């Protein structure tokens, strides 16, 4: 599948060899072309994955994520070319280089057939995101945000490397096909328990889990718009993809060992949904909504049934798109008002009607409105959990209620009421922002037209 990797490594020097006022046009055009090309991996065999070579293969789980990343890059470029207008040419090229490198590492991550190569790229995605957050942020807390983002990930993912090298020393290989065909049960011993923990906690903190989620609000608030988009859309799904890949080796230990993680995920989903209600900031609310949705995905992966896996894949894609759109919508208001407080700018529907419509659509898709793919994933996960235990429906229904509550609360506070009477610099919406919103939202509806493309390999 080098026909997708090589064009990105050509996006790099093309960006570096462009004219001072033509970098954005070229980058956007060629990234959109690359996403169109990557749209060709959606043709998946029902039997087994597509194995292009010894190193790279594509599965029904990998293809939606690859398409999402390749589609994400142009939107990030469109959103970044507003606050970077005063930057010099070299720093603009460096920013685009960081974005392109992040896309390249993400593309190579979702298709690597060997677990150590997957780990290497999964961790190589840390350098560009960190540079972006700590170099092109806005407040003085971006340094602490970057430190938290780096160390929460690394302190949980270093044991994964030891676990993987030990696995290769014992079984003899780390290729995913060989791992899946030659898989054997894990006995009940302390050594195997710590093997479980080492294999799981890295992806758990990448989700993040409820107890290990402290880095996410800092990173998503203090990052620039492109950093927030890429963090909330694809960089969170690395943990889910990792657990869905690594869980095959773990059984039968996982049934016994998933009780604390399931409990944390459910209760913390409730807790973060409740936290979203009493939030004075606008980006923190979206960050905590991401935490709640990813906790639901964690439950789906942990109970480990085919319906749960399909729901997890659908929810991952839908949440990526919705969270990216919400972050862009918040960023437009932040650029108008130059503050992140929610109640500062009120009654924006009378001043920006089309943005009011975009806000309404994003909030509707955030609270799982039928028949959007958000609801498809959420409902499949809820059904799988109900089969797992009939009492989980209480927690799921409470989460749904609180999600609707805080989504409509944000929509009403930001859009309805009367204007603030003293903000007279709210200019009419540009064409760029409306185009970005439309390019975020139309794929969601087009996908709910044909939902079998994002239901994963268990379909």
């Amino acid at each position: 599948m080098l026909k997708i990797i090589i064009p990105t490594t050509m996006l790099l020097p093309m960006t570096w060899m462009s004219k001072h006022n033509m970098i954005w046009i070229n980058a956007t055009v060629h990234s959109l072309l690359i996403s169109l090309i990557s749209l060709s991996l959606l043709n998946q065999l029902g039997e087994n994955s597509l194995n292009f070579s010894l190193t790279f293969f594509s599965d029904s789980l990998s293809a939606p994520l690859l398409v999402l990343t390749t589609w994400l890059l142009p939107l990030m470029l469109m959103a970044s070319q507003s606050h970077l207008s005063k930057e010099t040419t070299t720093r603009k090229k460096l920013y685009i280089t960081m974005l392109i490198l992040l896309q390249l590492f993400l593309i190579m991550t979702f298709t690597a057939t060997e677990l150590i190569l997957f780990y290497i790229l999964f961790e190589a995605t840390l350098v560009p995101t960190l540079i972006i957050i700590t170099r092109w942020g806005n407040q003085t807390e971006r340094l602490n945000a970057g430190l938290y983002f780096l160390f929460y990930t690394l302190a949980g993912s270093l044991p994964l490397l030891v676990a993987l090298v030990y696995i290769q020393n014992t079984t003899g290989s780390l290729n995913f096909l060989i791992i899946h065909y030659w898989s054997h049960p894990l006995s009940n011993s302390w050594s195997n328990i710590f093997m479980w923990l080492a294999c799981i906690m890295a992806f758990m903190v990448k989700m993040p889990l409820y107890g290990l989620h402290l880095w996410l609000p800092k990173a998503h608030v203090e990052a620039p718009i492109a950093g927030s988009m890429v963090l909330a859309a694809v960089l969170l799904k690395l943990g889910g993809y990792g657990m869905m890949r690594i869980t095959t080796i773990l059984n039968p230990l996982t049934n016994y060992m998933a009780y604390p993680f399931l409990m944390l995920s459910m209760w913390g989903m409730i807790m973060t949904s409740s936290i979203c209600l009493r939030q004075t900031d606008l980006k923190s609310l979206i960050a905590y909504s991401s935490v709640s949705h990813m906790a639901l995905v964690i439950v789906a992966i942990m109970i480990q049934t085919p319906w749960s896996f399909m729901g997890a894949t659908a929810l991952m894609i839908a949440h990526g798109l919705t969270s990216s759109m919400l972050f862009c919508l918040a960023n437009t208001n932040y650029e108008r008002v130059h503050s992140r407080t929610m109640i500062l700018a009120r009654g924006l529907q009378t001043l920006l009607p089309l943005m009011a419509t975009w806000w309404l659509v994003a909030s509707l898709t955030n609270l799982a409105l039928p028949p959007s793919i958000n609801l498809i994933g959420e409902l499949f996960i809820i059904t799988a959990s109900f089969s797992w235990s009939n009492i989980t429906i209480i927690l799921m229904g409470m989460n749904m209620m609180i999600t609707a509550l805080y989504s409509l609360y944000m929509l009403i506070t930001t859009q309805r009421g009367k204007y603030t009477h003293h903000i007279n610099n709210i200019k009419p919406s540009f064409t760029r922002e409306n185009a970005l919103m439309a390019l975020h939202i139309l794929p969601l509806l087009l996908l709910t037209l044909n939902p079998k493309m994002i239901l994963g390999p268990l379909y």
Binding site: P185, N251, P252, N255, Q304, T305
Partner: protein, 121 residues
């Protein structure tokens, strides 16, 4: 260090005559291409440090960088391949020389191997 001391090993050869029985790496080898790319990156960094036009300051210097990196990489790859071939040869000779330590075990089919089933529920 397992291979530091070996029978019939000239100390500072870096390429024993026994290594000429192996196929030399092709000149279009991807590792050689990466070595040339490393040379090009070093040349660009050299141009940047001296405050010169990065892309086109010195063409002869960049050419020398690339060719030096490729020249060293060829022999580095030759030695690496020789050492891996030597390792495999010694491994096979040892496993053949000691058959009792590497016995051929029975080949059961899954129809008679009993594996315990773990239901997911």
């Amino acid at each position: 260090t397992m291979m530091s001391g070996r029978p019939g090993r000239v100390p500072l050869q870096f390429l024993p005559n026994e290594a000429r029985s192996l196929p030399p790496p092709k000149l279009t080898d991807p590792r050689l291409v990466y070595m040339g790319f490393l040379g090009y990156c070093s040349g660009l960094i050299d141009n940047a440090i001296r405050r010169r036009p990065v892309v086109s300051a010195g063409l002869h210097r960049q050419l020398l960088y690339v060719t030096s990196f490729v020249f060293f990489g060829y022999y580095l790859l030759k030695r690496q391949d020789y050492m891996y071939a030597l390792r495999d040869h010694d491994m096979f000779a040892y496993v053949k020389s000691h058959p009792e330590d590497f016995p051929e075990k029975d080949k059961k089919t899954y129809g008679e191997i009993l594996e315990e089933f773990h239901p997911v529920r």
